[PDB]
Design a protein around this ligand. Structure first.
Ligand SMILES: C=Cc1cc(N(C)C)nc(S(C)(=O)=O)n1
Lengths: 415, 556
């Protein structure tokens, strides 16, 4: 219910005002969902109607979870989070289980049903304002603010973290093998056991959470080992034209910003003079040395690349064509923490925005598992298109931040 | 009267203070028109003289105006407005006629006075004080203060609309089939009740309104087929917009103009092409809202084109939820796009012209896509669903494009409409270098100081060019050199550049561009049969590039 607890007071960062984010228009199917849902929530004291004396707002919308179901609210607290983010202690519980990424399987649960117990600090409620829109602006918007900890607030798993440790203590004892990481609204649960077993030790945890009053759905299956970084590789075919060598050189020249031992001069030697593109050039030994030499640096992973906790994680995506998408995750230019591809598209799926939406989620749950932080995305799409269609494929309870860019001619340098 | 609703609490801005703007009065004329309008309002309870003295103050420049012998007071809350807390705008836009459905009966009550019938936060009236002067250029004088939502105040439509949706909630509960929509002083009441029962609800509602201090006219406007809601004309089977006339007067008081921005941007939601983001500048700050202001060359131009768009009335049908929505787009005057949204042929709900253009170098397919998006957003906003599209483009033109575009794009469900000018790709670049083509090594250079440069090329057939340039920049000579190569070569050519800049633009495949130069390159591009553009790093001594570089470099 709403258990008699002292409201943990909370205060935005200094100098900063609460969110004032305009609301995106929603389809009718969605506005109905959000009207029902909020109606129940207001009945149960979870939220309250407010008037327009409250200048703050936060987008709302609705998604239809993973592998079908029936609607769910989702409040885009991005702006309020970064306006409130990491206060004092209570922060992201433990500095993230560095182990979890190693476990054979990881499963995800939606413990978000918690949070609706704990009241929210009086003087903060107003910063949680949110407004269900109206089709054709017929009725005014229906504004609610929160009274309990809200599902997407980041300040929520923080405040509730004392209690979740208690609830879980008994389970982690009877199971010191199994790793348990809370991020935002989900618990990431990773074992080493065999599928049938692991999936058993998950329900136990669901029932264990029930016996402490939490209640869950009734996410994904995740296999962290086997997230193999993708090493940059050079063309193999022998029959080099002046073109092939030119591409080759340009690429190695760029790739020399990542790996400092790479040399090009023996390949520029083969290209002296003003030759035509088509013209086949005999690969001299000294060159085929430099090329086998170089080929074998692009092999071993890099050194000098360590996560820096106080710095944002960035993530670039490039459309590669055949339903393939390449991405890299990094914190300063050219020092990649990970690089991967994502594919698996044909027929009843081919839809740039859909694939890009799926990749953005998968990349993001890789980051949560590997560092306990979501990456600020660089999306190869146009603001309008993306803002127009993303909530149609979203199935996750968090939302990473993102920017919009024009992919350079470096789609090439990765694949 | 004055509604008994509970007031909305209203704070002055974070660390701020009320308007202490002293009155600039004295006219000995019309200072009598006030105190008559005031002492009437003082009786209806809308204001009251302030006891224990001081302070704060707002102007009261009253303009009786050529309303045909009328006396009108006009508090200027412009400065109080800047100190009042922000409010949330709870609507995404003004409603659109086409978004209405057919109802057997509709009525449009005019809420009488309204802002004037909702009380003001008690603690906040103090800051709404004003003054009426007298003979003795000394107090004497007289000092009032508002008890109800003041006319120009910043919070008066937000608060008023909140007070109203409150007052109605009970009535909407007992009557779930009646639909009431509010918009300022107009209240639309649709229903599928027999003409007779309706009129009775409409009476029950007028009483509810009255018990809550809200009066609604019984002589009812001039209700013929033209029932008027929000300045639209609703007929059981169509809506029409009353062509707006923008009167030409040079008595353009700061007010009269301030009222023009209101009317014009109300119109832009019905009419595509209204610009008002210009003459707004004929304001900014506080400059006596009676001070006749002269038309500039910047605003008097556009306002002149405005009368032109509003010239021709607009109309359309109502929305029926059992049918899909179909949107059709056609290409017009290069970057000009027309579109219609309908459900039954020839029966349009809404038509428009989209122009915009996105970037400095665009093309037709991406430009179309932009329109398919804007139109999509519109459909969700007005009807909350997505339309099916008919488009001047071939499944295979779109197919090859997205499948060779580094960015990601997408259009919902669509159908080829074989129509006037089709949208097509005005050329394509080779993916491989062409065999037996003069391989052009291009390059330019500019001296950021003197602003001089050169652009030139070198081929694998001994052909060379170097052109001296005045007032260019590096990235401009990079495009210049590419142009040379294009124009001095056969139908089939291989160009090789070191400018990732120049390479970006060309690889996008623009057919229109901001820069004239890029156009000349565009022109040249389509005149060719086969073109293949290549990139290599500067200063690696790569054969060809190295020679061209040296050649154009008596600048570097
Ligand atoms: C100027 C504001 C305004 C406002 C308005 N509304 C809001 C109906 N209508 C007009 S009108 C009669 O010119 O179409 N103007």
């Amino acid at each position: 219910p709403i258990s008699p607890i002292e409201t943990v007071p909370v205060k935005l960062k200094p100098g900063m005002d609460g969110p004032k984010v305009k609301q995106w228009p929603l389809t009718e199917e969605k506005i109905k969902a959000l009207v029902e849902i909020c109606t129940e929530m207001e009945k149960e004291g979870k939220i309250s109607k407010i008037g327009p004396e409250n200048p703050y707002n936060t987008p709302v919308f609705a998604i239809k979870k993973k592998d079908s179901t029936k609607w769910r609210k989702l409040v885009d607290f991005r702006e309020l989070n970064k306006r409130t983010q990491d206060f004092w202690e209570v922060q992201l519980g433990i500095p993230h289980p560095a182990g979890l990424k190693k476990k054979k399987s990881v499963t995800v649960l939606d413990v978000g049903d918690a949070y609706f117990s704990v009241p929210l600090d009086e003087d903060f409620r107003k910063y949680t304002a949110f407004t269900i829109p109206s089709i054709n602006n017929e009725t005014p918007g229906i504004r609610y603010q929160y009274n309990v900890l809200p599902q997407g607030w980041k300040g929520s798993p923080a405040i509730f973290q004392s209690s979740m440790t208690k609830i879980l203590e008994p389970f982690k004892k009877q199971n010191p093998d199994i790793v348990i990481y809370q991020y935002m609204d989900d618990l990431y649960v990773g074992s080493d056991l065999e599928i049938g077993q692991h999936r058993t030790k998950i329900e136990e945890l669901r029932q264990h959470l029930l016996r402490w009053g939490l209640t869950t759905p009734d996410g994904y299956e995740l296999h962290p080992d086997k997230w193999t970084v993708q090493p940059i590789v050079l063309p193999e075919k022998d029959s080099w034209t002046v073109n092939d060598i030119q591409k080759l050189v340009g690429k190695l020249n760029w790739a020399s910003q990542i790996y400092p031992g790479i040399k090009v001069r023996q390949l520029c030697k083969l290209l002296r003079g003003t030759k035509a593109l088509t013209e086949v050039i005999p690969l001299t030994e000294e060159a085929e040395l430099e090329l086998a030499e170089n080929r074998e640096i692009l092999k071993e992973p890099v050194h000098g690349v360590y996560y820096d906790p106080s710095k944002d994680l960035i993530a670039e995506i490039q459309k590669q064509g055949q339903g393939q998408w390449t991405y890299q995750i990094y914190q300063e230019p050219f020092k990649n923490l990970k690089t991967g591809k994502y594919a698996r598209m044909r027929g009843a799926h081919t839809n740039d925005v859909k694939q890009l939406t799926e990749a953005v989620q998968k990349i993001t749950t890789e980051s949560i598992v590997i560092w306990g932080k979501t990456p600020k995305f660089k999306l190869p799409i146009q603001k309008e298109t993306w803002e127009t269609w993303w909530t149609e494929y979203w199935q996750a309870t968090w939302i990473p931040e993102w920017e919009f860019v024009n992919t350079p001619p470096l789609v090439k340098l990765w694949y | 009267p004055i509604s008994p609703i509970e007031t909305v609490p209203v704070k002055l801005k974070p660390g701020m203070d009320g308007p202490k703007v002293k009155q600039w009065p004295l006219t000995e004329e019309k200072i009598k028109a006030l105190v008559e309008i005031c002492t009437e309002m003082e009786k209806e309870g809308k204001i009251s003289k302030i006891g224990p003295e001081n302070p704060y103050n707002t102007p009261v420049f009253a303009i009786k105006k050529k309303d045909s012998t009328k006396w009108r007071k006009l508090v200027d809350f412009r400065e109080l407005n800047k100190r009042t807390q922000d409010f949330w705008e709870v609507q995404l836009g003004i409603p659109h006629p086409a978004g209405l459905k057919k109802k057997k009966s509709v009525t449009v009550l005019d809420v009488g006075d309204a802002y004037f019938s909702v009380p003001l936060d008690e603690d906040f009236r103090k800051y709404t004080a004003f003054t009426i002067p007298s003979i003795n250029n000394e107090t004497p004088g007289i000092r009032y203060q508002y008890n109800v939502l003041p006319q120009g105040w910043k919070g008066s439509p937000a608060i008023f609309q909140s007070s109203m949706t409150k007052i109605l909630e009970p009535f909407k509960k007992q009557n779930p089939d009646i639909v009431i929509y509010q918009y300022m002083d107009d209240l639309y009441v649709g229903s599928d009740l027999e003409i007779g029962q309706h009129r009775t609800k409409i009476e029950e509602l007028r009483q509810h309104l009255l018990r809550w201090g809200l009066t609604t006219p019984d002589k009812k406007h001039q209700k013929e087929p033209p029932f008027l809601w929000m300045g639209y004309e609703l007929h059981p089977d169509k809506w029409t917009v009353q062509p707006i006339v923008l009167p030409e007067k040079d008595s353009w008081t700061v007010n009269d103009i301030q009222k023009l921005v209101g009317k014009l941007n109300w119109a832009s939601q019905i009419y595509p092409g209204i610009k008002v983001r210009q003459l707004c500048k004929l304001l900014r700050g506080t400059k006596a809202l009676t001070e006749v202001i002269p038309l500039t060359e910047e605003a008097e131009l556009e306002l002149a084109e405005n009368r032109e768009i509003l010239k021709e009335p607009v109309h359309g049908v109502y929305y029926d939820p059992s049918k899909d929505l179909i949107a059709e787009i056609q290409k017009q005057g290069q970057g000009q796009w027309t579109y219609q949204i309908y459900q039954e042929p020839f029966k349009n709900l809404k038509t428009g012209k989209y122009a915009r253009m996105r970037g400095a170098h665009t093309n037709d397919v991406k430009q179309l896509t932009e329109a398919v998006q804007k139109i999509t957003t519109e459909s969700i906003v007005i009807w909350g669903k997505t339309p099916k599209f008919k488009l001047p483009i071939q499944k295979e033109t779109w197919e090859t494009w997205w499948t060779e575009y580094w960015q990601a794009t997408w259009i919902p469900e669509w159908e080829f409409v074989n129509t006037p000018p089709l949208v097509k790709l005005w050329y394509q670049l080779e993916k491989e270098p062409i065999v037996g083509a003069e391989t052009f090594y291009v390059d330019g250079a500019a001296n950021r100081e003197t602003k001089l440069g050169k652009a030139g090329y070198v081929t694998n057939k001994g052909r060379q060019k170097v052109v001296p340039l005045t007032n260019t920049t590096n990235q401009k000579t990079q495009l210049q050199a590419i142009y040379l190569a294009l124009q001095d070569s056969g139908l089939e050519v291989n160009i090789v550049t070191d400018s990732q800049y120049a390479l970006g633009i060309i690889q996008a495949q623009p057919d229109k561009s901001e820069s004239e130069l890029v156009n000349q390159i565009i022109e040249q591009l389509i005149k060719k049969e086969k073109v293949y553009l290549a990139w290599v790093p500067a200063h690696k001594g790569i054969g060809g590039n190295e020679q061209v570089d040296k050649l154009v470099s008596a600048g570097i």
